């Protein structure tokens, strides 16, 4: 099996940490991504070609560049960052409403669940305005990228739902 994945989200959400936890089986100390990282990960008979694009302000107008061919979107959110959750919501909907992204299944990593008072999956579902969207295939997976909690579960969802 094969799946092209685009992984997006605000800067500091946990995207690169997730990528290399999956690719290298270990939590690494990251630095902000100036462009992108790309890795192919084999998981339970599916090869995921994962494009992790930098989430800094200045880079976001370039996100659209990476849409073509995307079969699954992974959108990573920092669940402890209530100051920027509405910003994350705005970005997510811009992505999924794009003509090139209409067919993509949507995995949300509700990341940093280890942190005190971090938003739970049900809160993330509300705050990202996913409840309205009833014509798309989406799922909110709680995760802690640094321990690995929830990551395999997310990849399992992608395989189960990709048609």
């Amino acid at each position: 099996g094969s799946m092209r994945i685009l992984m997006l989200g605000l800067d500091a959400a946990g995207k690169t940490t997730i990528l290399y936890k999956l690719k290298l089986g270990q939590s690494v100390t990251t630095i902000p991504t100036v462009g992108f990282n790309v890795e192919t990960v084999t998981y339970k008979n599916v090869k995921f070609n994962v494009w992790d694009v930098g989430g800094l302000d200045k880079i976001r107008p370039l996100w659209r560049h990476y849409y073509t061919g995307t079969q699954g979107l992974i959108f990573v959110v920092d669940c402890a960052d209530r100051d920027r959750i509405d910003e994350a919501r705005q970005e997510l909907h811009r992505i999924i409403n794009d003509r090139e992204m209409r067919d993509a299944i949507i995995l949300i990593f509700a990341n940093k669940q280890d942190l005190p008072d971090a938003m739970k999956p049900h809160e993330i579902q509300e705050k990202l305005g996913l409840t309205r969207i009833r014509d798309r295939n989406w799922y909110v997976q709680p995760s802690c990228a640094t321990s690995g909690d929830g990551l395999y579960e997310g990849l399992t969802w992608l395989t189960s739902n990709y048609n």
Binding site: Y20, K23, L24, Q26, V28, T29, T30, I31, V34, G35, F36, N37, V38, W51, K58, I59, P61, L62, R64, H65, Y66, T68, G69
Partner: protein
Amino acid sequence: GNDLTHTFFNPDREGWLLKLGGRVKTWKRRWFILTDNCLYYFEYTTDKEPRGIIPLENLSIREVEDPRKPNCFELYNPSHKGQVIKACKTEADGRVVEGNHVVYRISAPSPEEKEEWMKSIKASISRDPFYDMLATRKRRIAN
């Protein structure tokens, strides 16, 4: 298409260069834009999306002599000789794919512009052990 040009606003340097291909060693005239630690290149100045993107992570610059093109330099990784440089380029259908380069050989139209580009690119390299860490760990388990 999409106009992505806010990405390239107020760059460090821009200009026309000739560049050598990766696997297929052909020369192409490209408009380059250096900004925010990335080297972008385009087919035409009127393009609103890049042909190629080269994140400037732990790369170095060397002057080289070329038998046919003048004012040449190469982008390369000094720590991992022979290893593919991270980059992406756009295929005919618009799909972004990984680059195949172990070096980027580039020709400038004058020695002055060569010097300008080398100085600018060197100043814009993101240097950090993180990149070497990733390459080393990846290579240890690659199958």
